[PDB]
PDB file of all heavy atoms in Angstrom:
ATOM      1  N   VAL C 196      30.499   1.032  69.735  1.00  0.00           N
ATOM      2  CA  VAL C 196      30.822   2.132  70.648  1.00  0.00           C
ATOM      3  C   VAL C 196      30.599   3.478  69.967  1.00  0.00           C
ATOM      4  O   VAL C 196      30.253   4.453  70.631  1.00  0.00           O
ATOM      5  CB  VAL C 196      32.280   2.092  71.179  1.00  0.00           C
ATOM      6  CG1 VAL C 196      32.449   3.128  72.273  1.00  0.00           C
ATOM      7  CG2 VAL C 196      32.616   0.725  71.727  1.00  0.00           C
ATOM      8  N   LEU C 197      30.817   3.528  68.653  1.00  0.00           N
ATOM      9  CA  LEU C 197      30.609   4.750  67.874  1.00  0.00           C
ATOM     10  C   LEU C 197      29.187   5.265  68.056  1.00  0.00           C
ATOM     11  O   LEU C 197      28.982   6.465  68.225  1.00  0.00           O
ATOM     12  CB  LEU C 197      30.869   4.496  66.395  1.00  0.00           C
ATOM     13  CG  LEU C 197      32.151   5.098  65.827  1.00  0.00           C
ATOM     14  CD1 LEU C 197      33.304   4.929  66.798  1.00  0.00           C
ATOM     15  CD2 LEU C 197      32.471   4.432  64.490  1.00  0.00           C
ATOM     16  N   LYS C 198      28.218   4.352  68.049  1.00  0.00           N
ATOM     17  CA  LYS C 198      26.817   4.703  68.241  1.00  0.00           C
ATOM     18  C   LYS C 198      26.564   5.386  69.579  1.00  0.00           C
ATOM     19  O   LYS C 198      25.742   6.302  69.654  1.00  0.00           O
ATOM     20  CB  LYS C 198      25.912   3.479  68.111  1.00  0.00           C
ATOM     21  CG  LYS C 198      25.281   3.288  66.718  1.00  0.00           C
ATOM     22  CD  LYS C 198      26.096   2.358  65.815  1.00  0.00           C
ATOM     23  CE  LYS C 198      25.390   2.039  64.475  1.00  0.00           C
ATOM     24  NZ  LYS C 198      24.117   1.230  64.573  1.00  0.00           N
ATOM     25  N   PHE C 199      27.245   4.941  70.639  1.00  0.00           N
ATOM     26  CA  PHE C 199      27.097   5.551  71.972  1.00  0.00           C
ATOM     27  C   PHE C 199      27.481   7.035  71.886  1.00  0.00           C
ATOM     28  O   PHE C 199      26.848   7.898  72.494  1.00  0.00           O
ATOM     29  CB  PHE C 199      28.060   4.907  73.007  1.00  0.00           C
ATOM     30  CG  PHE C 199      27.641   3.545  73.527  1.00  0.00           C
ATOM     31  CD1 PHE C 199      26.584   2.842  72.975  1.00  0.00           C
ATOM     32  CD2 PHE C 199      28.321   2.982  74.604  1.00  0.00           C
ATOM     33  CE1 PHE C 199      26.206   1.606  73.489  1.00  0.00           C
ATOM     34  CE2 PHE C 199      27.949   1.752  75.121  1.00  0.00           C
ATOM     35  CZ  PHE C 199      26.893   1.063  74.567  1.00  0.00           C
ATOM     36  N   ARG C 200      28.559   7.304  71.159  1.00  0.00           N
ATOM     37  CA  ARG C 200      29.099   8.653  71.000  1.00  0.00           C
ATOM     38  C   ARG C 200      28.215   9.635  70.218  1.00  0.00           C
ATOM     39  O   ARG C 200      28.508  10.831  70.170  1.00  0.00           O
ATOM     40  CB  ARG C 200      30.500   8.578  70.377  1.00  0.00           C
ATOM     41  CG  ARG C 200      31.479   7.754  71.214  1.00  0.00           C
ATOM     42  CD  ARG C 200      32.870   7.711  70.627  1.00  0.00           C
ATOM     43  NE  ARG C 200      33.754   6.864  71.432  1.00  0.00           N
ATOM     44  CZ  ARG C 200      34.605   5.970  70.934  1.00  0.00           C
ATOM     45  NH1 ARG C 200      34.701   5.788  69.622  1.00  0.00           N
ATOM     46  NH2 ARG C 200      35.376   5.263  71.750  1.00  0.00           N
ATOM     47  N   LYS C 201      27.144   9.131  69.616  1.00  0.00           N
ATOM     48  CA  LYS C 201      26.233   9.969  68.847  1.00  0.00           C
ATOM     49  C   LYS C 201      25.111  10.546  69.704  1.00  0.00           C
ATOM     50  O   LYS C 201      24.316  11.370  69.240  1.00  0.00           O
ATOM     51  CB  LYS C 201      25.657   9.181  67.665  1.00  0.00           C
ATOM     52  CG  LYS C 201      26.667   8.905  66.552  1.00  0.00           C
ATOM     53  CD  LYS C 201      26.011   8.154  65.382  1.00  0.00           C
ATOM     54  CE  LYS C 201      26.918   8.087  64.130  1.00  0.00           C
ATOM     55  NZ  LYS C 201      28.235   7.367  64.324  1.00  0.00           N
ATOM     56  N   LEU C 202      25.046  10.117  70.955  1.00  0.00           N
ATOM     57  CA  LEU C 202      24.038  10.598  71.878  1.00  0.00           C
ATOM     58  C   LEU C 202      24.342  12.044  72.273  1.00  0.00           C
ATOM     59  O   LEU C 202      25.461  12.522  72.095  1.00  0.00           O
ATOM     60  CB  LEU C 202      24.006   9.694  73.111  1.00  0.00           C
ATOM     61  CG  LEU C 202      22.887   8.653  73.271  1.00  0.00           C
ATOM     62  CD1 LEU C 202      22.328   8.171  71.943  1.00  0.00           C
ATOM     63  CD2 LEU C 202      23.431   7.491  74.082  1.00  0.00           C
ATOM     64  N   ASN C 203      23.350  12.737  72.819  1.00  0.00           N
ATOM     65  CA  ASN C 203      23.510  14.131  73.226  1.00  0.00           C
ATOM     66  C   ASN C 203      23.244  14.345  74.714  1.00  0.00           C
ATOM     67  O   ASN C 203      22.350  13.730  75.298  1.00  0.00           O
ATOM     68  CB  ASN C 203      22.514  15.026  72.471  1.00  0.00           C
ATOM     69  CG  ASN C 203      22.859  15.240  70.995  1.00  0.00           C
ATOM     70  OD1 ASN C 203      22.054  15.827  70.261  1.00  0.00           O
ATOM     71  ND2 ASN C 203      24.045  14.821  70.563  1.00  0.00           N
ATOM     72  N   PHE C 204      23.996  15.258  75.311  1.00  0.00           N
ATOM     73  CA  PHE C 204      23.807  15.617  76.713  1.00  0.00           C
ATOM     74  C   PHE C 204      22.599  16.567  76.770  1.00  0.00           C
ATOM     75  O   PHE C 204      21.771  16.513  77.679  1.00  0.00           O
ATOM     76  CB  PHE C 204      25.017  16.406  77.234  1.00  0.00           C
ATOM     77  CG  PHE C 204      26.205  15.561  77.640  1.00  0.00           C
ATOM     78  CD1 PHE C 204      27.472  15.842  77.133  1.00  0.00           C
ATOM     79  CD2 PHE C 204      26.075  14.555  78.596  1.00  0.00           C
ATOM     80  CE1 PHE C 204      28.598  15.143  77.575  1.00  0.00           C
ATOM     81  CE2 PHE C 204      27.204  13.843  79.049  1.00  0.00           C
ATOM     82  CZ  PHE C 204      28.463  14.143  78.537  1.00  0.00           C
ATOM     83  N   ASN C 205      22.542  17.461  75.787  1.00  0.00           N
ATOM     84  CA  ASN C 205      21.502  18.478  75.686  1.00  0.00           C
ATOM     85  C   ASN C 205      20.124  17.926  75.351  1.00  0.00           C
ATOM     86  O   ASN C 205      19.979  16.780  74.934  1.00  0.00           O
ATOM     87  CB  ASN C 205      21.890  19.488  74.603  1.00  0.00           C
ATOM     88  CG  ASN C 205      22.033  18.837  73.239  1.00  0.00           C
ATOM     89  OD1 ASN C 205      23.042  18.183  72.961  1.00  0.00           O
ATOM     90  ND2 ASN C 205      21.005  18.971  72.395  1.00  0.00           N
ATOM     91  N   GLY C 206      19.113  18.765  75.548  1.00  0.00           N
ATOM     92  CA  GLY C 206      17.751  18.389  75.219  1.00  0.00           C
ATOM     93  C   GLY C 206      17.453  18.843  73.795  1.00  0.00           C
ATOM     94  O   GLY C 206      18.243  19.581  73.192  1.00  0.00           O
ATOM     95  N   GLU C 207      16.325  18.402  73.252  1.00  0.00           N
ATOM     96  CA  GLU C 207      15.935  18.770  71.896  1.00  0.00           C
ATOM     97  C   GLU C 207      15.782  20.275  71.735  1.00  0.00           C
ATOM     98  O   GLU C 207      15.256  20.955  72.612  1.00  0.00           O
ATOM     99  CB  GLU C 207      14.631  18.084  71.500  1.00  0.00           C
ATOM    100  CG  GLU C 207      14.272  18.322  70.036  1.00  0.00           C
ATOM    101  CD  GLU C 207      13.035  17.572  69.581  1.00  0.00           C
ATOM    102  OE1 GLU C 207      12.484  16.771  70.372  1.00  0.00           O
ATOM    103  OE2 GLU C 207      12.608  17.789  68.421  1.00  0.00           O
ATOM    104  N   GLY C 208      16.276  20.791  70.618  1.00  0.00           N
ATOM    105  CA  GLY C 208      16.170  22.214  70.357  1.00  0.00           C
ATOM    106  C   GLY C 208      17.253  23.057  71.001  1.00  0.00           C
ATOM    107  O   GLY C 208      17.220  24.289  70.903  1.00  0.00           O
ATOM    108  N   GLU C 209      18.187  22.415  71.701  1.00  0.00           N
ATOM    109  CA  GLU C 209      19.292  23.132  72.337  1.00  0.00           C
ATOM    110  C   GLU C 209      20.549  22.857  71.529  1.00  0.00           C
ATOM    111  O   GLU C 209      20.572  21.946  70.696  1.00  0.00           O
ATOM    112  CB  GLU C 209      19.523  22.633  73.760  1.00  0.00           C
ATOM    113  CG  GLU C 209      18.443  22.948  74.754  1.00  0.00           C
ATOM    114  CD  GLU C 209      18.717  22.291  76.087  1.00  0.00           C
ATOM    115  OE1 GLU C 209      19.901  22.220  76.498  1.00  0.00           O
ATOM    116  OE2 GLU C 209      17.752  21.828  76.729  1.00  0.00           O
ATOM    117  N   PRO C 210      21.595  23.671  71.713  1.00  0.00           N
ATOM    118  CA  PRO C 210      22.801  23.391  70.938  1.00  0.00           C
ATOM    119  C   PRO C 210      23.348  22.011  71.318  1.00  0.00           C
ATOM    120  O   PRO C 210      23.285  21.585  72.474  1.00  0.00           O
ATOM    121  CB  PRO C 210      23.734  24.545  71.310  1.00  0.00           C
ATOM    122  CG  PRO C 210      23.238  25.003  72.644  1.00  0.00           C
ATOM    123  CD  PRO C 210      21.746  24.901  72.509  1.00  0.00           C
ATOM    124  N   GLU C 211      23.824  21.308  70.307  1.00  0.00           N
ATOM    125  CA  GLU C 211      24.343  19.963  70.447  1.00  0.00           C
ATOM    126  C   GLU C 211      25.663  19.811  71.204  1.00  0.00           C
ATOM    127  O   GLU C 211      26.665  20.434  70.855  1.00  0.00           O
ATOM    128  CB  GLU C 211      24.450  19.328  69.051  1.00  0.00           C
ATOM    129  CG  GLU C 211      24.837  17.850  69.035  1.00  0.00           C
ATOM    130  CD  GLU C 211      24.307  17.108  67.810  1.00  0.00           C
ATOM    131  OE1 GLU C 211      23.337  17.594  67.180  1.00  0.00           O
ATOM    132  OE2 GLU C 211      24.835  16.019  67.493  1.00  0.00           O
ATOM    133  N   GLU C 212      25.636  18.977  72.244  1.00  0.00           N
ATOM    134  CA  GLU C 212      26.818  18.641  73.053  1.00  0.00           C
ATOM    135  C   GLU C 212      26.833  17.112  73.007  1.00  0.00           C
ATOM    136  O   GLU C 212      25.917  16.472  73.541  1.00  0.00           O
ATOM    137  CB  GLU C 212      26.647  19.040  74.514  1.00  0.00           C
ATOM    138  CG  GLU C 212      26.187  20.455  74.778  1.00  0.00           C
ATOM    139  CD  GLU C 212      25.777  20.653  76.240  1.00  0.00           C
ATOM    140  OE1 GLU C 212      26.555  20.247  77.145  1.00  0.00           O
ATOM    141  OE2 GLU C 212      24.667  21.195  76.480  1.00  0.00           O
ATOM    142  N   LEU C 213      27.821  16.527  72.344  1.00  0.00           N
ATOM    143  CA  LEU C 213      27.885  15.077  72.252  1.00  0.00           C
ATOM    144  C   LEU C 213      28.135  14.444  73.621  1.00  0.00           C
ATOM    145  O   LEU C 213      28.932  14.948  74.422  1.00  0.00           O
ATOM    146  CB  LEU C 213      28.956  14.644  71.250  1.00  0.00           C
ATOM    147  CG  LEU C 213      28.680  15.055  69.794  1.00  0.00           C
ATOM    148  CD1 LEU C 213      29.789  14.573  68.889  1.00  0.00           C
ATOM    149  CD2 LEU C 213      27.340  14.496  69.330  1.00  0.00           C
ATOM    150  N   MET C 214      27.418  13.361  73.895  1.00  0.00           N
ATOM    151  CA  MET C 214      27.560  12.645  75.158  1.00  0.00           C
ATOM    152  C   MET C 214      28.766  11.705  75.089  1.00  0.00           C
ATOM    153  O   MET C 214      28.675  10.599  74.565  1.00  0.00           O
ATOM    154  CB  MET C 214      26.295  11.846  75.459  1.00  0.00           C
ATOM    155  CG  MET C 214      26.271  11.202  76.847  1.00  0.00           C
ATOM    156  SD  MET C 214      24.786  10.281  77.111  1.00  0.00           S
ATOM    157  CE  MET C 214      23.665  11.593  77.667  1.00  0.00           C
ATOM    158  N   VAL C 215      29.909  12.186  75.558  1.00  0.00           N
ATOM    159  CA  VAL C 215      31.146  11.399  75.580  1.00  0.00           C
ATOM    160  C   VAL C 215      31.882  11.747  76.856  1.00  0.00           C
ATOM    161  O   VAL C 215      31.651  12.806  77.433  1.00  0.00           O
ATOM    162  CB  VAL C 215      32.084  11.690  74.369  1.00  0.00           C
ATOM    163  CG1 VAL C 215      31.452  11.200  73.093  1.00  0.00           C
ATOM    164  CG2 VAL C 215      32.426  13.188  74.284  1.00  0.00           C
ATOM    165  N   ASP C 216      32.753  10.853  77.311  1.00  0.00           N
ATOM    166  CA  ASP C 216      33.510  11.093  78.536  1.00  0.00           C
ATOM    167  C   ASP C 216      32.641  11.387  79.755  1.00  0.00           C
ATOM    168  O   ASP C 216      32.907  12.320  80.503  1.00  0.00           O
ATOM    169  CB  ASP C 216      34.542  12.207  78.332  1.00  0.00           C
ATOM    170  CG  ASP C 216      35.618  11.821  77.337  1.00  0.00           C
ATOM    171  OD1 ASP C 216      35.966  10.620  77.242  1.00  0.00           O
ATOM    172  OD2 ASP C 216      36.114  12.717  76.630  1.00  0.00           O
ATOM    173  N   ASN C 217      31.588  10.598  79.938  1.00  0.00           N
ATOM    174  CA  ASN C 217      30.706  10.762  81.085  1.00  0.00           C
ATOM    175  C   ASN C 217      31.214   9.833  82.214  1.00  0.00           C
ATOM    176  O   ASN C 217      30.471   9.044  82.794  1.00  0.00           O
ATOM    177  CB  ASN C 217      29.255  10.437  80.704  1.00  0.00           C
ATOM    178  CG  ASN C 217      29.098   9.072  80.045  1.00  0.00           C
ATOM    179  OD1 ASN C 217      30.071   8.436  79.661  1.00  0.00           O
ATOM    180  ND2 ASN C 217      27.860   8.628  79.898  1.00  0.00           N
ATOM    181  N   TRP C 218      32.490   9.964  82.544  1.00  0.00           N
ATOM    182  CA  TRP C 218      33.084   9.120  83.571  1.00  0.00           C
ATOM    183  C   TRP C 218      33.832   9.965  84.590  1.00  0.00           C
ATOM    184  O   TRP C 218      34.380  11.016  84.262  1.00  0.00           O
ATOM    185  CB  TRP C 218      34.014   8.067  82.922  1.00  0.00           C
ATOM    186  CG  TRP C 218      35.042   8.639  81.955  1.00  0.00           C
ATOM    187  CD1 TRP C 218      34.876   8.854  80.620  1.00  0.00           C
ATOM    188  CD2 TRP C 218      36.375   9.079  82.265  1.00  0.00           C
ATOM    189  NE1 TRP C 218      36.014   9.407  80.077  1.00  0.00           N
ATOM    190  CE2 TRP C 218      36.949   9.557  81.064  1.00  0.00           C
ATOM    191  CE3 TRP C 218      37.139   9.111  83.438  1.00  0.00           C
ATOM    192  CZ2 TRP C 218      38.246  10.066  81.002  1.00  0.00           C
ATOM    193  CZ3 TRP C 218      38.431   9.617  83.378  1.00  0.00           C
ATOM    194  CH2 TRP C 218      38.970  10.089  82.169  1.00  0.00           C
ATOM    195  N   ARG C 219      33.828   9.501  85.835  1.00  0.00           N
ATOM    196  CA  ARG C 219      34.502  10.182  86.932  1.00  0.00           C
ATOM    197  C   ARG C 219      35.883   9.563  87.125  1.00  0.00           C
ATOM    198  O   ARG C 219      36.049   8.355  86.983  1.00  0.00           O
ATOM    199  CB  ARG C 219      33.699  10.014  88.227  1.00  0.00           C
ATOM    200  CG  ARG C 219      34.304  10.720  89.431  1.00  0.00           C
ATOM    201  CD  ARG C 219      33.504  10.427  90.689  1.00  0.00           C
ATOM    202  NE  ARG C 219      33.847  11.391  91.726  1.00  0.00           N
ATOM    203  CZ  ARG C 219      33.642  11.226  93.030  1.00  0.00           C
ATOM    204  NH1 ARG C 219      33.094  10.109  93.510  1.00  0.00           N
ATOM    205  NH2 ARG C 219      33.930  12.219  93.859  1.00  0.00           N
ATOM    206  N   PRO C 220      36.904  10.397  87.361  1.00  0.00           N
ATOM    207  CA  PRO C 220      38.247   9.851  87.559  1.00  0.00           C
ATOM    208  C   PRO C 220      38.372   9.089  88.899  1.00  0.00           C
ATOM    209  O   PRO C 220      37.577   9.281  89.820  1.00  0.00           O
ATOM    210  CB  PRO C 220      39.136  11.097  87.498  1.00  0.00           C
ATOM    211  CG  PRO C 220      38.223  12.196  87.934  1.00  0.00           C
ATOM    212  CD  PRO C 220      36.939  11.865  87.244  1.00  0.00           C
ATOM    213  N   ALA C 221      39.364   8.209  88.968  1.00  0.00           N
ATOM    214  CA  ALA C 221      39.624   7.401  90.154  1.00  0.00           C
ATOM    215  C   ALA C 221      39.829   8.251  91.408  1.00  0.00           C
ATOM    216  O   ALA C 221      40.447   9.310  91.366  1.00  0.00           O
ATOM    217  CB  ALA C 221      40.831   6.491  89.911  1.00  0.00           C
ATOM    218  N   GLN C 222      39.292   7.774  92.519  1.00  0.00           N
ATOM    219  CA  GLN C 222      39.373   8.452  93.797  1.00  0.00           C
ATOM    220  C   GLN C 222      40.344   7.680  94.703  1.00  0.00           C
ATOM    221  O   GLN C 222      40.611   6.497  94.468  1.00  0.00           O
ATOM    222  CB  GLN C 222      37.974   8.505  94.422  1.00  0.00           C
ATOM    223  CG  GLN C 222      36.945   9.285  93.592  1.00  0.00           C
ATOM    224  CD  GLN C 222      37.402  10.703  93.293  1.00  0.00           C
ATOM    225  OE1 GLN C 222      37.626  11.506  94.205  1.00  0.00           O
ATOM    226  NE2 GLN C 222      37.577  11.010  92.018  1.00  0.00           N
ATOM    227  N   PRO C 223      40.927   8.347  95.712  1.00  0.00           N
ATOM    228  CA  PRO C 223      41.859   7.657  96.606  1.00  0.00           C
ATOM    229  C   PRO C 223      41.160   6.553  97.386  1.00  0.00           C
ATOM    230  O   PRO C 223      40.026   6.713  97.837  1.00  0.00           O
ATOM    231  CB  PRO C 223      42.338   8.779  97.519  1.00  0.00           C
ATOM    232  CG  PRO C 223      41.169   9.670  97.580  1.00  0.00           C
ATOM    233  CD  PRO C 223      40.763   9.745  96.137  1.00  0.00           C
ATOM    234  N   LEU C 224      41.855   5.433  97.543  1.00  0.00           N
ATOM    235  CA  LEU C 224      41.322   4.267  98.243  1.00  0.00           C
ATOM    236  C   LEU C 224      41.166   4.515  99.740  1.00  0.00           C
ATOM    237  O   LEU C 224      40.243   3.992 100.365  1.00  0.00           O
ATOM    238  CB  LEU C 224      42.221   3.044  97.970  1.00  0.00           C
ATOM    239  CG  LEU C 224      41.803   1.615  98.345  1.00  0.00           C
ATOM    240  CD1 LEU C 224      40.503   1.215  97.668  1.00  0.00           C
ATOM    241  CD2 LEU C 224      42.927   0.664  97.947  1.00  0.00           C
ATOM    242  N   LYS C 225      42.041   5.345 100.299  1.00  0.00           N
ATOM    243  CA  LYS C 225      42.008   5.654 101.728  1.00  0.00           C
ATOM    244  C   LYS C 225      42.103   4.367 102.573  1.00  0.00           C
ATOM    245  O   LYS C 225      42.916   3.487 102.277  1.00  0.00           O
ATOM    246  CB  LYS C 225      40.764   6.475 102.088  1.00  0.00           C
ATOM    247  CG  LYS C 225      40.765   7.876 101.504  1.00  0.00           C
ATOM    248  CD  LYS C 225      39.782   8.763 102.246  1.00  0.00           C
ATOM    249  CE  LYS C 225      39.926  10.249 101.885  1.00  0.00           C
ATOM    250  NZ  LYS C 225      39.228  10.631 100.608  1.00  0.00           N
ATOM    251  N   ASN C 226      41.275   4.237 103.600  1.00  0.00           N
ATOM    252  CA  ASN C 226      41.347   3.047 104.446  1.00  0.00           C
ATOM    253  C   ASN C 226      40.418   1.916 104.034  1.00  0.00           C
ATOM    254  O   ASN C 226      39.496   1.546 104.785  1.00  0.00           O
ATOM    255  CB  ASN C 226      41.182   3.393 105.945  1.00  0.00           C
ATOM    256  CG  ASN C 226      40.145   4.499 106.207  1.00  0.00           C
ATOM    257  OD1 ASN C 226      40.460   5.705 106.132  1.00  0.00           O
ATOM    258  ND2 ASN C 226      38.913   4.095 106.546  1.00  0.00           N
ATOM    259  N   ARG C 227      40.672   1.371 102.843  1.00  0.00           N
ATOM    260  CA  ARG C 227      39.875   0.277 102.291  1.00  0.00           C
ATOM    261  C   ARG C 227      40.783  -0.752 101.655  1.00  0.00           C
ATOM    262  O   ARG C 227      41.876  -0.430 101.207  1.00  0.00           O
ATOM    263  CB  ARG C 227      38.891   0.786 101.228  1.00  0.00           C
ATOM    264  CG  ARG C 227      37.752   1.626 101.766  1.00  0.00           C
ATOM    265  CD  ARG C 227      36.913   2.161 100.624  1.00  0.00           C
ATOM    266  NE  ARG C 227      37.604   3.200  99.851  1.00  0.00           N
ATOM    267  CZ  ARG C 227      37.095   3.781  98.764  1.00  0.00           C
ATOM    268  NH1 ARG C 227      35.898   3.407  98.311  1.00  0.00           N
ATOM    269  NH2 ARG C 227      37.732   4.792  98.184  1.00  0.00           N
ATOM    270  N   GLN C 228      40.306  -1.986 101.587  1.00  0.00           N
ATOM    271  CA  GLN C 228      41.065  -3.069 100.998  1.00  0.00           C
ATOM    272  C   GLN C 228      40.194  -3.646  99.904  1.00  0.00           C
ATOM    273  O   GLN C 228      38.988  -3.765 100.073  1.00  0.00           O
ATOM    274  CB  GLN C 228      41.368  -4.148 102.059  1.00  0.00           C
ATOM    275  CG  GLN C 228      41.816  -5.529 101.521  1.00  0.00           C
ATOM    276  CD  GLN C 228      43.335  -5.728 101.436  1.00  0.00           C
ATOM    277  OE1 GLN C 228      43.965  -6.192 102.395  1.00  0.00           O
ATOM    278  NE2 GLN C 228      43.915  -5.445 100.268  1.00  0.00           N
ATOM    279  N   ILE C 229      40.787  -3.893  98.747  1.00  0.00           N
ATOM    280  CA  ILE C 229      40.058  -4.492  97.654  1.00  0.00           C
ATOM    281  C   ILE C 229      40.322  -5.981  97.769  1.00  0.00           C
ATOM    282  O   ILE C 229      41.472  -6.401  97.906  1.00  0.00           O
ATOM    283  CB  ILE C 229      40.564  -3.974  96.299  1.00  0.00           C
ATOM    284  CG1 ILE C 229      40.247  -2.478  96.168  1.00  0.00           C
ATOM    285  CG2 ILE C 229      39.932  -4.758  95.161  1.00  0.00           C
ATOM    286  CD1 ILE C 229      40.539  -1.913  94.806  1.00  0.00           C
ATOM    287  N   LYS C 230      39.270  -6.781  97.784  1.00  0.00           N
ATOM    288  CA  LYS C 230      39.456  -8.222  97.883  1.00  0.00           C
ATOM    289  C   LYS C 230      39.209  -8.850  96.523  1.00  0.00           C
ATOM    290  O   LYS C 230      38.464  -8.302  95.710  1.00  0.00           O
ATOM    291  CB  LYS C 230      38.503  -8.816  98.919  1.00  0.00           C
ATOM    292  CG  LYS C 230      38.307  -7.937 100.147  1.00  0.00           C
ATOM    293  CD  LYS C 230      38.720  -8.600 101.437  1.00  0.00           C
ATOM    294  CE  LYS C 230      40.240  -8.687 101.559  1.00  0.00           C
ATOM    295  NZ  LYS C 230      40.677  -9.337 102.851  1.00  0.00           N
TER     296      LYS C 230
END
């Protein structure tokens, strides 16, 4: 997993922004049922 964290959001030659926490938080279920 450490290796995943070494990736960059930015392109080459731009300031480095580590690619981490690329996840969206949970959304309300509303009118749905999980089976």
Side-chain angles (χ1 to χ4, degrees):
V196 189
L197 252 41
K198 264 94 174 294
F199 283 9
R200 301 182 182 136
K201 289 182 169 61
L202 257 28
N203 287 173
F204 279 128
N205 61 283
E207 186 176 355
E209 292 174 37
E211 186 152 339
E212 310 168 48
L213 295 180
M214 187 181 275
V215 292
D216 295 328
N217 53 348
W218 51 272
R219 181 184 196 200
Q222 298 304 299
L224 191 59
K225 293 199 169 82
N226 38 275
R227 290 176 289 177
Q228 164 94 90
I229 294 188
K230 322 240 73 179

